[PDB]
Coordinates of C-alpha atoms and ligand atoms in Angstrom, one line a residue:
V3 CA -15.2 -9.7 -18.9
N4 CA -13.4 -7.7 -16.0
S5 CA -10.5 -6.0 -15.9
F6 CA -8.2 -8.9 -13.1
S7 CA -4.6 -9.8 -15.0
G8 CA -2.3 -11.8 -14.3
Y9 CA -4.5 -14.3 -12.6
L10 CA -4.8 -17.6 -12.1
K11 CA -7.8 -19.9 -12.0
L12 CA -8.1 -22.2 -8.5
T13 CA -12.1 -23.3 -9.6
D14 CA -14.8 -22.1 -11.8
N15 CA -15.1 -19.1 -9.3
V16 CA -11.7 -18.3 -7.8
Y17 CA -8.2 -16.9 -8.6
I18 CA -4.9 -16.0 -7.4
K19 CA -1.7 -13.7 -7.8
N20 CA 1.3 -12.5 -6.4
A21 CA 1.0 -9.1 -5.0
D22 CA 0.4 -6.3 -3.5
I23 CA -3.5 -5.5 -2.5
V24 CA -2.8 -1.7 -2.8
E25 CA -1.1 -1.6 -6.3
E26 CA -3.6 -3.8 -7.4
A27 CA -7.2 -1.6 -6.3
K28 CA -5.2 1.1 -7.3
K29 CA -5.3 -0.4 -10.7
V30 CA -8.0 -2.5 -11.0
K31 CA -10.7 0.3 -9.2
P32 CA -12.4 -3.0 -8.3
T33 CA -16.7 -2.4 -7.2
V34 CA -15.4 -4.7 -3.6
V35 CA -12.1 -4.6 -1.7
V36 CA -11.4 -6.8 1.4
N37 CA -10.1 -5.6 4.1
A38 CA -8.5 -8.1 6.9
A39 CA -10.3 -6.1 9.5
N40 CA -10.4 -5.9 13.5
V41 CA -13.4 -6.0 15.4
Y42 CA -12.2 -2.2 16.5
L43 CA -12.2 -1.0 12.3
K44 CA -8.2 -0.3 14.0
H45 CA -6.4 -0.5 10.8
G46 CA -3.1 -0.5 12.4
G47 CA -0.4 -2.7 10.5
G48 CA -0.8 -5.9 8.3
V49 CA -4.0 -6.0 5.0
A50 CA -5.3 -2.9 7.4
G51 CA -2.4 -0.7 7.8
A52 CA -1.6 -0.8 4.3
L53 CA -4.9 0.0 2.8
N54 CA -5.8 2.6 5.9
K55 CA -2.1 4.6 4.5
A56 CA -2.7 4.8 1.0
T57 CA -5.9 5.9 1.8
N58 CA -3.9 9.3 3.7
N59 CA -6.1 7.5 6.7
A60 CA -9.2 8.6 5.7
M61 CA -10.3 5.1 5.6
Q62 CA -9.3 5.6 9.9
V63 CA -10.9 8.6 10.0
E64 CA -14.5 6.5 8.6
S65 CA -14.0 3.6 10.2
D66 CA -13.6 6.1 14.1
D67 CA -17.7 7.2 12.3
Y68 CA -18.2 4.4 12.0
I69 CA -18.0 2.9 15.4
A70 CA -18.8 5.6 17.8
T71 CA -22.2 5.2 15.6
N72 CA -22.5 1.3 16.0
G73 CA -20.0 -0.1 17.8
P74 CA -18.1 -3.0 17.5
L75 CA -18.5 -5.6 14.9
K76 CA -17.9 -9.7 15.1
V77 CA -15.5 -11.6 14.7
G78 CA -16.8 -13.3 11.7
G79 CA -18.5 -10.2 10.2
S80 CA -18.3 -7.7 8.7
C81 CA -19.7 -4.0 6.5
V82 CA -19.8 -1.6 3.6
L83 CA -17.8 0.9 4.1
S84 CA -15.8 3.5 1.1
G85 CA -13.5 2.8 -0.9
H86 CA -12.0 5.7 -0.7
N87 CA -9.3 6.1 -4.1
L88 CA -8.5 2.0 -3.9
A89 CA -12.1 0.6 -4.5
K90 CA -15.8 2.1 -5.2
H91 CA -16.9 0.0 -1.9
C92 CA -14.1 -1.7 1.2
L93 CA -15.9 -4.3 2.5
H94 CA -14.4 -4.7 6.4
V95 CA -14.0 -8.4 7.3
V96 CA -12.9 -9.8 10.5
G97 CA -11.5 -13.1 10.9
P98 CA -10.9 -14.7 14.0
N99 CA -7.1 -14.1 14.9
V100 CA -5.7 -16.9 16.7
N101 CA -2.7 -14.9 18.0
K102 CA -6.2 -13.8 20.4
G103 CA -7.1 -16.9 20.9
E104 CA -10.0 -16.9 18.0
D105 CA -11.7 -19.5 17.6
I106 CA -11.0 -21.0 13.8
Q107 CA -14.2 -22.8 12.7
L108 CA -14.9 -19.0 12.5
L109 CA -12.8 -18.1 9.4
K110 CA -15.7 -20.1 6.8
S111 CA -18.0 -18.1 9.1
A112 CA -16.0 -14.6 7.9
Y113 CA -15.9 -16.5 4.2
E114 CA -19.8 -15.7 4.2
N115 CA -19.5 -12.3 4.1
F116 CA -18.3 -12.8 -0.1
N117 CA -20.9 -14.2 -1.1
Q118 CA -23.1 -10.8 -1.0
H119 CA -20.8 -9.2 -3.6
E120 CA -20.5 -10.6 -7.5
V121 CA -16.9 -10.1 -7.6
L122 CA -14.0 -9.0 -5.0
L123 CA -10.3 -8.4 -3.9
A124 CA -9.6 -9.9 -0.5
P125 CA -6.9 -10.5 1.1
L126 CA -6.9 -14.4 2.6
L127 CA -8.6 -14.6 5.8
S128 CA -6.9 -14.5 8.8
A129 CA -3.2 -14.5 7.4
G130 CA -0.5 -12.9 8.0
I131 CA -0.3 -11.2 11.4
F132 CA -3.7 -13.1 12.4
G133 CA -1.9 -15.7 12.7
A134 CA -3.9 -18.2 10.5
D135 CA -2.4 -21.2 8.1
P136 CA -2.6 -19.4 5.0
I137 CA -3.0 -22.9 2.9
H138 CA -6.2 -23.5 5.4
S139 CA -7.2 -20.1 4.2
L140 CA -7.1 -21.2 0.8
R141 CA -9.1 -24.0 1.2
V142 CA -11.8 -22.8 3.7
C143 CA -11.8 -19.2 0.9
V144 CA -12.1 -22.3 -1.8
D145 CA -15.3 -24.2 -0.2
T146 CA -17.2 -21.2 1.5
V147 CA -17.1 -18.5 -1.5
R148 CA -19.4 -19.1 -4.4
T149 CA -18.7 -15.6 -5.9
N150 CA -16.1 -14.0 -7.8
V151 CA -12.7 -13.9 -5.9
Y152 CA -9.4 -12.1 -6.6
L153 CA -7.1 -13.2 -4.1
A154 CA -3.8 -11.5 -4.4
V155 CA -0.8 -12.5 -1.8
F156 CA 1.8 -10.1 -1.5
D157 CA 4.9 -13.1 -0.7
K158 CA 6.0 -14.4 -4.0
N159 CA 7.5 -17.7 -1.4
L160 CA 3.9 -17.8 0.3
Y161 CA 2.2 -17.5 -3.2
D162 CA 4.4 -20.6 -4.8
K163 CA 4.0 -22.7 -1.2
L164 CA -0.5 -22.1 -2.3
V165 CA -0.2 -22.7 -6.3
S166 CA 2.4 -26.0 -5.4
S167 CA -0.2 -27.7 -2.6
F168 CA -3.6 -27.0 -3.3
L169 CA -5.7 -29.6 -4.0
Ligands
ROO201 C1 -1.7 -14.5 3.7 C2 -0.2 -14.7 4.2 O1 -0.1 -15.1 5.7 C3 1.7 -14.2 5.6 C4 2.0 -15.0 7.1 N1 1.8 -16.5 7.1 C5 2.5 -17.2 7.1 N2 3.7 -16.7 6.1 C6 4.0 -18.0 5.2 N3 4.3 -19.3 5.3 C7 3.5 -19.5 6.3 N4 3.5 -20.4 6.6 C8 2.4 -21.0 8.1 C9 1.7 -22.2 9.1 C10 0.7 -21.3 10.3 C11 0.4 -20.3 10.2 C12 1.0 -18.8 9.2 C13 1.7 -19.3 8.2 C14 2.6 -18.8 7.0 C15 2.1 -14.1 4.9 C16 0.9 -13.7 3.6 C17 1.2 -12.9 1.9 O2 -0.1 -12.5 1.7 O3 2.3 -12.7 2.0

């Protein structure tokens, strides 16, 4: 039993809710919240900008030190950093950004990072400002992630479409 509430069960291991991931993290304080990161960990907008704003920019400060030491992530890759006031840990995962021309096949590799964590609160990778089709992202999630994932979808309209079209 875990503390996630109000989710619709899609499969054995994937759950979904219309929610603001920032508010959801603040309430649940999950072990892992996933950030929709870019390779530079520049958390300017979308999910990343909202998560970082909720940490009062501490996420960005920590991220800048990470990049200065380690260099950029790979598209499809990830790193574990602090969850600050939102979670124990933040798993920064880089999905392909269609608005940069990145290969959508890398979306499966991005979701594979979730399998290193037993339970996660996460957004749909490559959705929103990353330009992928969220219905496709949900399908890849279900077909790739084997650990327990609680998906927060900010937009109510999109949430209803994702549920209604789910196979
Ligand atoms: C996970 C997510 O993606 C988005 C923005 N992209 C889209 N939004 C609604 N319909 C959409 N059709 C599409 C067809 C092709 C590409 C993108 C969209 C798309 C907002 C959210 C959210 O979490 O609220």
